Design an enzyme around this catalytic site. Structure first.
Site: not given
Ligand code: SF4
Ligand SMILES: Cc1cc2nc3c(=O)[nH]c(=O)nc-3n(C[C@H](O)[C@H](O)[C@H](O)COP(=O)(O)O)c2cc1C
Ligand code: SF4
Ligand code: SF4
Ligand code: SF4
Ligand code: SF4
Ligand code: SF4
Ligand code: SF4
Ligand code: FES
Ligand code: FES
Ligand code: FES
Ligand SMILES: [Zn+2]
Lengths: 151, 571, 630
Positions: B278, B281, B298, B318, B357, B360, B365, B500
């Site tokens: 990053e 970049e 992120c 990004s 996550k 995700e 992809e 987080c």
């Molecule tokens: S815990 Fe909250 S801020 Fe951290 S990656 Fe997951 S959604 Fe995003």
């Protein structure tokens, strides 16, 4: 799709009041009947409103609905004045002979039941009205003539 | 400042005017129960269980009652206790009582209040709630245990401004729903997980996949590598009765080693990988001076919020992958050829505190780089399942050669700590020198404000930087950018309020000031390390010089990059 | 139409259209309310208007307007609202003949025009005849139903066209507003508080303190709003008031807006009533063209505007807290207090929310002064209260009485006694918002304080009379079912306790009940009354608790003896056989699937209540009819 032209000029005429949501959801039912399962999030994403809030509005008020409505709607009153003259048994006679429960409709021909309370003819016996042909004194055996001319 | 004189349960109280009669009695060594109240929400008054008795003799709610001069109140009168008992009997009369199957077992607030108020025989037995369970992805919704407190709706309304879910129906049959009972994936949700964190029952939970981990372990030919997140090291100890903010790195490493995992690694290595990429970049974008401002990638929830609500900012984002997927690609591409294992025969497990996550991980992809993901609560349940005593373990280190790390990658669990990890590297790469003394730390990007702004001067060149925590503040700052009042250069967004450390996977706590303790723990962990710079890591340089030979190369563009496509379906 | 200038021009037009009514000789009018327009009201109108167009009558025009302002009409057809006595209809009245005709079903519509209009004679076979006395009544005031009513709030209804602005102006109204603009506001508020006027519907709070508190709040833009929506399915007053004469409501709005300093207002009426909302749209548009609504009203500089918002049903919408939410465009969920609605209501602006019976007495109070209005009734709470009488009485419908009179003449003298010569059992006041009163407390005067000590509140004002025919457990269960279906479901007490009480009452009335249910009902009623959030949950268990408090004998009969004294609960029916009237047909044995009746042919049978499924087919299938439900 022809549906996406009748819902367009209604968000421009009766939508100039700041805070009007109830009026728009009422005229749609007025002009088409069935509140569509697809138009709701369209009108949501259109102006400023999330779909969740108007879904919550649509299911709260009993006037709104999300199921097919027949051509003819029958109401059985059931107010506290038209309850003492044996108005409990007439709905039982309806469900015994026609088949559908209160709030459930036979979508086949034209029939739908509804439970709006204490119309303006209060003082003239339990008033089971058809859409535009309100009756007077009624008896569990009179039901048959309702099926005679209205069929 | 104007103080108010009153008595509560026969004790004189001095408190400022404006506080309620429940929040101003907590400092007398007395606490009255309530389910509809949280410290981050406006009072709502749906529980009606926090009632007290005033002088007149009628029950008055406490969570929304301002205090005035001259009241006497009592919170232990028999009438109040009888009313509370009857209200909890009314609640538990319509609750499906499978407390063995409940994911929220031993942490449900309804269970604790049913134990405290001494309920022994439910006299009101009748029709229960009988709904049908549907699947939604990483959020498991069971509208049979809902008490209709409204916390989830308010936290998706008042704070997040996402408006994903709302009430539906009326009377005894009301519930919480998306429009037309669609799955949460197709609705306007962004998978932040805040509604999971505040639910005081087992209605909202996680789709747990310990089973697949178990047949992954039991397969004799599969080799398992497990990675740990920076924000897990400061919150796991709360699951074992410790004070929050205790550094438990060695203990959790020993626990993971004894759990049967073949290899254990930290994701701070891939975090430093992301920082250096990053920084390259950002230097490139400064040299060309195009596509400003540029947003970080992120946070998966931020990416979903852009792809659903703001599809016009896609060229300005990004293209760097999240650290989890970069570590997965490294493990399945470089490490596999070094050990000598087939790519299909490697199983990568992650322990991250976020809920987005989980969604995700299964995007088509990403070519299925990682196979399964966990959260901290499931890790603690596994640790207690195998019988490992967490208190009396021995500290041991990470594996090789992806175990060691730097101090720049240990502050990702704080709002602002990502860009604070990138400014040092940008300073080093553009100026040519390294910061010394206290100039390493940037005090302008630390705190808990909604929108943080700074103007950083580096060798006479000024850059404007901004931090937005919470999607509401992100929307406010996007409105400010589209207004064109001022121009930025590098913008960080984290969906959860506070970074987080306040994700949906973190353990449940009742202390109102947990954020300060977690920040102090993170900063103490950062300051207790010899190396504080991402560039000075060795194995990152070794990996580049053996496999890529240059950051932002064609191989890196092939493996460490992805593209985003709009999700805003036209209506 | 022409725009109205200052007060002297208003008085000039007043005189000019006062000439219009005295340039006429004969008038005919029909009850245009919803009571007549259900068994044929416009049908009677067209059965008679075409006769007037084929009997050599030229001046037939109905709707008076500016184009026809100077037409001396020999006959004039009028359209008036709820004149009263809606039990027997449709109602017809002509002037200046002075007749009161009931039962005007179109069988002799030609006789009325040939006899009364031409020969000036009165038909006696169709006039009202009291079955108890047999006397014939010809004058409206001579009728016992109209004998002791005070026509004060309803002064202009029954004689003023709701669709014509020129009709209300020509009666003598809209002068209180003209007097109001020429004088200060503080003395208006002082006259309001001095008159003793306090809220008609619901609470009963004094309106003077609310108006003064709204005055004392220094805000740029505050609101005035109308809660005319009779949610309870007991009575009809929202129907009568607006469809009779809506202009007095607009004048009360103007008075209130001039007093407190409001510039825009709202009226909340249910969209399920089409005629009333249509009449309000017509009145608002005609007043807007008339010029009394808008900016620079009569050259003073005061500004005002009215909006009519159509509701969407639910009874829990006018709580004074859920109504602002409903108008705002969200769910009708009540919010907590404090802050109250007088400090931050609709869009965080101050609001005043009065039922539309309080906005009706304001022009009368302004015109006559507080000394005259306080002279009626007990000085503790003044004014008069309107009621809707229904149930098993000979005369039903709308009534207006001086508050403070004994209930006995209200139910018997005005109501004409109980129908079918049966026996009176109980009275319910306020619908779901009130309790029961039995025959023993019939000698209590009607007012706030004495009824407060009796546990019952008048609420909206619907009075229903129930006889000995029914069982009180079924009546209480009906109220509980209405409350269960009509809640909102936000706080635990109402939402859960109402369902639990409904289940307990259904268990009791089905004969499956057990001992100790009454104590559970009392405990649940106390908890739900104490711990609710809005008024609906605080008031819900009142009918059940009152019925338990006054009729424990019925509950003990239902629980232990398994017999219903009134024979109205079918789940506790008892079929019995007459031995002499039985010929041993045995059809009851054949048609009943379980066959609990067993006996020999040509002999009387015996019924075993233990194995009887109580389907009732035994009496209705055997043609002899010797089986009776006793
Ligand atoms: S815990 Fe909250 S801020 Fe951290 S990656 Fe997951 S959604 Fe995003
Ligand atoms: C369950 C419930 C029903 C109500 N029904 C009515 C009603 O039918 N008509 C009405 O004017 N107000 C009704 N109200 C209350 C309104 O807030 C009312 O207009 C207000 O209390 C009147 O104040 P006022 O007497 O000072 O004018 C109801 C309130 C509740 C909680
Ligand atoms: S939510 Fe709580 S009370 Fe309900 S089943 Fe789960 S643990 Fe038990
Ligand atoms: S995950 Fe976040 S956006 Fe989705 S419903 Fe819960 S709080 Fe709302
Ligand atoms: S899902 Fe959980 S947070 Fe949401 S209303 Fe139900 S119990 Fe409350
Ligand atoms: S008491 Fe009943 S009607 Fe009132 S807010 Fe609570 S649930 Fe709704
Ligand atoms: S219906 Fe009458 S005649 Fe027939 S079996 Fe019964 S009692 Fe006898
Ligand atoms: S309803 Fe009862 S009494 Fe009548 S035939 Fe059937 S079992 Fe016999
Ligand atoms: S209660 Fe039935 S019409 Fe009035
Ligand atoms: S939970 Fe505190 S007042 Fe409702
Ligand atoms: S006005 Fe029509 S029935 Fe009375
Ligand atoms: Zn009974």
């Amino acid at each position: 799709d022809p549906r996406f032209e009748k819902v367009d000029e209604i968000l421009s005429k009766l939508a100039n009041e700041r805070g009007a949501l109830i009026a728009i959801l009422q005229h749609v039912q007025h002009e088409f009947g069935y509140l569509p399962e697809d138009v709701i999030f369209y009108i949501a994403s259109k102006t400023g409103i999330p779909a969740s809030k108007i879904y919550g509005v649509a299911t709260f008020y009993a006037q709104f609905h999300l199921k097919p409505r027949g051509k003819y709607v029958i109401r059985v009153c059931l107010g506290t004045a038209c309850h003492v003259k044996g108005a409990n048994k007439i709905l039982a006679e309806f469900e015994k002979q026609l088949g559908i429960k209160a709030g459930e409709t036979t979508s086949d021909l034209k029939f739908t039941l509804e439970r709006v309370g204490c119309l303006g003819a209060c003082g003239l016996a339990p008033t089971v009205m058809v859409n535009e042909k309100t009756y007077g004194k009624m008896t569990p055996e009179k039901v048959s003539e309702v099926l005679k001319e209205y069929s | 400042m104007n103080m108010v004189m009153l008595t509560i349960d026969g004790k004189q109280v001095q408190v400022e005017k404006g506080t309620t009669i429940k929040k101003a009695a907590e400092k007398l060594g007395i606490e009255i129960p309530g389910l509809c109240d949280d410290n981050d929400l406006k009072p709502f008054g749906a529980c009606r269980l926090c009632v007290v008795e005033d002088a007149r003799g009628n029950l008055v709610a406490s969570c929304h009652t301002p205090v005035r001069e001259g009241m006497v109140v009592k919170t232990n009168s028999p009438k109040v206790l009888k009313a509370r008992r009857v209200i909890l009997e009314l609640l538990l009369s319509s609750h499906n009582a499978d407390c063995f199957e409940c994911d929220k077992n031993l942490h449900c607030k309804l269970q604790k209040y049913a134990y405290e108020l001494n309920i022994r025989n439910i006299r009101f037995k009748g029709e229960k709630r009988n709904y049908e369970i549907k699947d939604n992805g990483p959020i498991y919704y069971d509208p049979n245990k809902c008490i209709l407190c409204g916390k989830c709706v308010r936290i998706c309304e008042e704070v997040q401004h996402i408006c994903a879910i709302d009430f539906a129906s009326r009377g005894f049959k009301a519930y919480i729903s998306t429009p037309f009972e669609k799955p949460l994936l197709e609705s306007d949700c962004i998978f932040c997980g805040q509604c999971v964190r505040v639910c005081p029952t087992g209605a909202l939970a996680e789709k747990t996949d310990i089973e697949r981990i178990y047949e992954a372990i039991s397969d004799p030919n599969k080799v398992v590598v497990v990675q740990v997140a920076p924000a897990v090291r400061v919150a796991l100890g709360e699951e074992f009765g410790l004070e929050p903010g205790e550094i438990v790195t060695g203990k959790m490493v020993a626990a993971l080693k004894r759990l049967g995992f073949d290899k254990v690694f930290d994701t701070q290595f891939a975090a430093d990988m992301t920082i250096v990429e990053e920084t390259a970049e950002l230097v490139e974008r400064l040299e060309k001076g195009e596509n400003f401002p540029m947003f970080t990638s992120c946070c998966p929830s931020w990416i979903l919020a852009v792809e659903k609500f703001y599809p016009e900012l896609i060229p300005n984002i990004s293209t760097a992958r999240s650290p989890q997927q970069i570590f997965g690609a490294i493990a399945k591409n470089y490490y596999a050829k070094k050990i000598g294992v087939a790519r299909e025969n490697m199983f990568v497990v992650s322990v991250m505190p976020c809920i987005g996550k989980k969604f995700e991980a299964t995007r088509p992809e990403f070519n299925n780089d990682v196979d399964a993901v966990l959260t901290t609560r499931e890790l603690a349940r596994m640790i207690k399942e195998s019988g490992i005593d967490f208190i009396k373990l021995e500290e041991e280190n990470f594996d090789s050669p992806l175990g060691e790390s730097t101090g720049a990658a240990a502050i990702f669990g704080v709002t602002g700590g990502v860009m604070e990890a990138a400014l040092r590297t940008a300073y080093s790469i553009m100026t040519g020198e390294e910061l010394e003394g206290d100039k390493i730390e940037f005090t302008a990007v630390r705190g808990l404000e909604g929108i943080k702004e700074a103007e950083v001067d580096i060798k006479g060149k000024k850059v404007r930087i901004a931090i937005a925590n919470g999607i509401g503040n992100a929307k406010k700052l996007i409105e400010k950018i589209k207004s064109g009042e001022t121009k930025y250069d590098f913008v960080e967004v984290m969906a959860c309020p506070g970074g987080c450390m306040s994700g949906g996977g973190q353990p449940y706590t009742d202390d109102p000031e947990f954020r300060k303790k977690r920040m102090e723990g993170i900063y103490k962990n950062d300051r207790n390390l010899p190396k504080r710079k991402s560039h000075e890591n060795e194995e990152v340089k070794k990996v580049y010089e053996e496999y890529y030979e240059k950051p932002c190369g064609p191989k890196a563009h092939e493996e460490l990059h992805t593209h985003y496509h709009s999700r805003k379906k036209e209506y | 139409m022409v725009k109205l200038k200052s007060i002297q021009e208003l008085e000039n037009l007043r005189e000019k259209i006062k000439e219009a009514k005295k340039k006429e000789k004969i008038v005919i009018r029909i009850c245009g309310g919803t009571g007549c327009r259900a068994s044929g009201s416009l049908a009677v109108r067209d059965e008679l208007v075409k006769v007037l167009k084929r009997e050599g009558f030229a001046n037939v025009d109905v709707n008076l307007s500016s184009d026809c302002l100077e037409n001396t009409s020999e006959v004039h057809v009028k359209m008036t609202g709820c004149q009263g006595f809606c039990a027997q209809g449709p109602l017809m009245t002509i002037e200046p003949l002075g007749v009161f005709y009931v039962g005007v079903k179109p069988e002799d519509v030609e006789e009325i025009v040939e006899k009364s209009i031409k020969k000036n004679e009165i038909i006696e076979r169709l006039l009202y005849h009291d079955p108890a006395t047999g006397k014939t009544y010809v004058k409206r005031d001579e009728n016992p139903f109209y004998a002791k009513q005070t026509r004060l709030v309803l002064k202009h209804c029954g004689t003023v066209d709701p669709a014509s602005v020129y009709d209300y102006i020509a009666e003598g109204g809209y002068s209180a507003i003209a007097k109001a603009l020429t004088m200060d506001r503080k003395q208006i508020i002082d006259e309001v508080i001095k008159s003793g006027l306090r809220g008609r519907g619901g609470a009963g709070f004094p309106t003077g303190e609310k108006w003064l508190g709204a005055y004392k709040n220094q805000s740029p833009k505050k609101y005035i709003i109308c809660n005319g929506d009779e949610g309870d399915p007991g009575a009809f007053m929202d129907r009568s008031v607006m469809e009779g004469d809506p202009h007095k409501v607009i004048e009360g709005m103007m008075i209130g807006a001039y007093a407190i300093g409001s510039d825009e207002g709202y009226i909340y009426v249910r969209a399920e009533y089409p005629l009333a909302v249509q009449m309000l749209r017509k009145a608002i548009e005609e007043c807007e063209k008339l010029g009394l609504l808008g900016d620079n009203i009569l050259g003073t500089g005061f500004s005002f505007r009215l909006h009519v918002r159509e509701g969407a049903g639910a009874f829990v919408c006018g709580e004074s807290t859920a109504l602002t939410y409903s108008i705002e465009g969200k769910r009708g969920m009540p919010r907590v207090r404090p802050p109250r609605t007088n400090e931050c209501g609709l869009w965080e602006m101050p609001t005043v929310l009065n039922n539309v019976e309080t906005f009706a007495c304001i022009p009368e109070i302004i015109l006559n002064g507080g000394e005259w209005f306080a002279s009626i009734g007990t000085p503790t709470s003044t004014g008069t209260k309107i009621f809707a009488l229904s149930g098993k009485v000979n005369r039903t419908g709308l009534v207006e009485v001086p508050m403070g009179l004994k209930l006995r003449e209200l139910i018997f003298d005005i109501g004409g006694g109980i129908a079918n010569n049966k026996k009176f059992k109980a009275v319910q006041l306020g619908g779901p918002s009130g309790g029961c009163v039995p025959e023993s407390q019939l000698d209590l005067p009607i007012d706030f304080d004495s009824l407060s000590k009796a546990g019952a509140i008048m609420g909206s004002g619907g009075v229903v009379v129930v006889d000995e025919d029914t069982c009180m457990v079924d009546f209480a269960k009906f109220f509980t079912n209405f409350i269960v279906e009509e809640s909102c479901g936000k706080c635990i007490p109402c939402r859960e306790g109402n369902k639990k009480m409904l289940e307990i009452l259904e268990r009791i009335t089905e004969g499956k009940g057990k001992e100790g249910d009454i104590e559970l009902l009392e405990e649940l009623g106390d908890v739900i009354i104490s711990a609710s959030l809005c008024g609906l949950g605080k008031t819900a268990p009142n009918p059940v608790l009152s019925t338990i408090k006054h009729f424990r004998d019925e509950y003990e009969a239902h629980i232990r003896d398994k017999k219903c004294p009134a024979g109205a609960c079918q789940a506790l029916a008892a079929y019995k056989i007459d031995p002499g009237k039985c010929i041993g047909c045995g059809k009851c044995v054949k048609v009943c699937p379980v066959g609990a009746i067993s006996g020999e042919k040509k002999k009387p049978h015996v019924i075993d209540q233990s194995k009887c499924i109580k389907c009732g087919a035994c009496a209705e299938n055997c043609p002899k009819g010797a089986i009776y439900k006793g």
